[PDB]
Amino acid sequence: NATRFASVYAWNRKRISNCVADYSVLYNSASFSTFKCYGVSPTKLNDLC
Amino acid sequence: NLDSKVGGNYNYLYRLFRKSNLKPFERDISTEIYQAGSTPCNGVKGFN
Numbered sequence A: 001n002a003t004r005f006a007s008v009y010a011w012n013r014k015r016i017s018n019c020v021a022d023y024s025v026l027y028n029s030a031s032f033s034t035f036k037c038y039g040v041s042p043t044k045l046n047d048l049c
Numbered sequence B: 001n002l003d004s005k006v007g008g009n010y011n012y013l014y015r016l017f018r019k020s021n022l023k024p025f026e027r028d029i030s031t032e033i034y035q036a037g038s039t040p041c042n043g044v045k046g047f048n
Helices: A024-028 A043-047
Strands: none
């Protein structure tokens, strides 16, 4: 939801640690055009650390 | 040298996805469409 994003070559890398990750909100918000994962199902992420 | 064919052999079938793991002495012959995980996709193709 940030105003501006970095360029595809300028892409910033954000480190995320020491917090809770809730992916059930982003999946049911219908705020995405497409959602796809590789090797891990999205609902399993709730039970994984 | 026998069963392998050029482009793949689709005659042999296997079940890749299921809701829960089967018990010993338990089998599934059903080819019907089932849910591929814990995602509320209702079994239909798509939604991962």
